[PDB]
Structure formats: C-alpha cells, structure tokens
C-alpha cells in the first residue's frame, strides 16, 4: 500500500514522534491552537499551518504521492516556526534541533 | 477592600507580571486534568487552585483578610508539591515563584 520510499518516510515520521526527541519535538506535536495558547496573531502571519499531527493524518490517508510532497509539509512546518517566532527563542532552537534530525535520516534514502 | 488586601492585589499583580512569566505560567490557569490525561489529579488534589481563581476571588471581594488570600496561594503551591515528584521542573518553578511571594508577603504592615 505504501511505496518503498514512503515506507522510509513513515519510519522517519515515527522517530520524530517517539519519546527519544520529545524534549524538543513537543511544540510540533499538535496543530497550533491560536486561542488555546493565546497567540492571536499566528494565523495573520502563518497562512498555511502545518504540524506533525496534520502530517501523520495525511500519511495514513495516503495523500502523499511521493517523498517530495512529504518533505514539503515538514519543511513548511519548520518554516512556519522560523517565520513567526523570534530567532533567539528556545523553540526555534528546538525546531533547529528537530529539523537537523529530519534532514539527516531523509538524506539517507534510495 | 481594606488597606491590607490592597497590598495583596499588588502582590498578585506582581506574580502575574511580565517579570515572572518565565516560571509563573504553569499557575496562570487551573490544571486541566482532561487536557493532560491525568485521571488521578482530582483523586489526590481535592482543592485545586491557581492564580486565575485567586484573582476571581479577589475581584469578587471573597477574601475576608489577607490570611485567606495567602492560604489559597500556598494551597496552590501545596497542590503542586503534593502531586509532582520532587525532581520535577514544576517544583523548581513553584519554589522560585513562591520565593517571590513569601518575600513580598513578609513585608506588610
């Protein structure tokens, strides 16, 4: 049901959501609830929200055609974090630390 | 409100200020046991308390004296200490916030 490339993608998605990286992956677990976190401007600047919860739903829904479309949403997720938060925020360092994990395993695929 | 509780609201205002947001934010709103999936929080903590609840009682003129105000603020910290393990970071944040409260509160006529 899943291609060989997308099998590796789902395994990558699984590691990013594991207990291993929970110290810095937690900001990206669920979609940004602008009201629940009192960030009333998130949707005035981020017009295409994305988070790991949304990404897994699209993966299980078989909505990703290739690995490129999967990499697009995860990189969009980090771009939303970098575009909205100040550069010195610790969550930005968490986005960096989590993306550095993603880019590593994603680069090692045939 | 009497003159004593006027100073109390100023302490509550400082506890809710921009200054202490780094460690006071867990105690801003009540503990949502369902949003955190802690089915035992209300089986162990029978009197939950937070700073929002304290402000409602302060604005509602429900505190008779400053002692009743300090009782609920210490109950809030006591709730945090009773449930979480001592090595949890919430304990370190509760102490540093309580350390601020006890300092302001001890200096009252």
């Amino acid at each position: 049901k899943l291609s060989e490339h997308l099998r590796y993608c789902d395994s990558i998605l699984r590691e990013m959501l594991s207990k291993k990286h929970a110290a810095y992956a937690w900001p990206f677990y669920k979609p940004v609830d602008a009201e629940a976190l009192e960030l009333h401007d998130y949707h005035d600047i981020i017009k295409h929200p994305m988070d790991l919860s949304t990404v897994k739903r699209k993966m299980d829904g078989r909505e990703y055609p290739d690995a490129q479309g999967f990499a697009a949403d995860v990189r969009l997720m980090f771009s939303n974090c970098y575009k909205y938060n100040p550069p010195d925020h610790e969550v930005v360092a968490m986005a960096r630390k989590l993306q550095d994990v993603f880019e590593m395993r994603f680069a090692k695929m045939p | 409100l009497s003159e004593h509780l006027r100073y109390c609201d100023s302490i509550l205002r400082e506890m809710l200020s921009k200054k202490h947001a780094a460690y006071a934010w867990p105690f801003y709103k009540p503990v949502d046991a369902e949003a955190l999936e802690l089915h035992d929080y209300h089986d162990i903590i029978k009197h939950p308390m937070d700073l929002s609840t304290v402000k409602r009682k302060m604005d509602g003129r429900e505190y008779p004296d400053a002692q009743g105000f300090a009782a609920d603020v210490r109950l809030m910290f006591s709730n945090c200490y009773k449930y979480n393990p001592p090595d949890h970071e919430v304990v370190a944040m509760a102490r540093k916030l309580q350390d601020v409260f006890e300092m302001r509160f001890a200096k009252m006529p």
Partner: peptide, 12 residues
C-alpha cells in the same frame, strides 16, 4: 504537556 505561549512542560 502544559503549553501556553510557546512554553512547554512534561507533566505526564
């Protein structure tokens, strides 16, 4: 996870 404004805290 207690959340609020881009802060976080593992209670469970």
């Amino acid at each position: 996870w207690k959340q609020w404004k881009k802060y976080g805290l593992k209670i469970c």
